[PDB]
Amino acid sequence: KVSFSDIVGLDDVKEALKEAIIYPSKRPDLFPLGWPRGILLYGPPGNGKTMLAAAVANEIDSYFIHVDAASIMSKGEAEKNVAKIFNTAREYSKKDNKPAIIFVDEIDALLVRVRNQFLKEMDGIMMVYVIGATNKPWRLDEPFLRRFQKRIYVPLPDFNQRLALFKYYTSKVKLGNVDLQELAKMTEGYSASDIRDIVQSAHMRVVKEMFEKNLSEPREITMDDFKEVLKIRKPSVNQELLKAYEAWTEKF
Numbered sequence: 001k002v003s004f005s006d007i008v009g010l011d012d013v014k015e016a017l018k019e020a021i022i023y024p025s026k027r028p029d030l031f032p033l034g035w036p037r038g039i040l041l042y043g044p045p046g047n048g049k050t051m052l053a054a055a056v057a058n059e060i061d062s063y064f065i066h067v068d069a070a071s072i073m074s075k076g077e078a079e080k081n082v083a084k085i086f087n088t089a090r091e092y093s094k095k096d097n098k099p100a101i102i103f104v105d106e107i108d109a110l111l112v113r114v115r116n117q118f119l120k121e122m123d124g125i126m127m128v129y130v131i132g133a134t135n136k137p138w139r140l141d142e143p144f145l146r147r148f149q150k151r152i153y154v155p156l157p158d159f160n161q162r163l164a165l166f167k168y169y170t171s172k173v174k175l176g177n178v179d180l181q182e183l184a185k186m187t188e189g190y191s192a193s194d195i196r197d198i199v200q201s202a203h204m205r206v207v208k209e210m211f212e213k214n215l216s217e218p219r220e221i222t223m224d225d226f227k228e229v230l231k232i233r234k235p236s237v238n239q240e241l242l243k244a245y246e247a248w249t250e251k252f
């Protein structure tokens, strides 16, 4: 569904995806020195890596093949599955004159037989892209990383993104006099998925009250409800984990 224009902020992430995938897919003649087919999206979990990847496929009218690495690693059947993913990508790309994107969620789960088969297919496509997503980029060894020449940090949401997230999630519920700009100010450090969880939990407070009081509709959610949720629900990404991303980035 999603396109770049549905996505608030992330201007640097968008630019880096345009440079790596959208521009060369639209104008391959403008990249005579070549371009990477392996894009690594990395950073804290619950920040829209999957949605960014889907949005890229929409921008370039690509086929999108969504792969979860943990499901491949629990199949033998696994090498066959890796081969079949890349060959489906190739055959559909050529047959329809259209790029194909293989999105591999939790790519670090591949970590050696599957790892080796995977890298051989990467070398082989080098119009198919592989976007790998990880929140543990330190788990990838340097040889593995050499097939991913574009590495993009996807950050925690900033003020404008948090505000758009609250607007989106709360449009589904009944709010009282709740200033969404102040909820966004108070949530510096929380991830996109923490924000969804905050709204769900604030709604759960009023629903639970409605049942306990035997009423038929919940009351409006108030600022008091959100603050009570934020006392218990802390950012799921702490300072330690964030400095690990900075250290990995400067190193790589």
Ligand SMILES: [Cl-]
Pocket (backbone or CB within 6 Å): 044, 045, 046, 047, 048, 049, 050
């Ligand atoms: Cl994510």
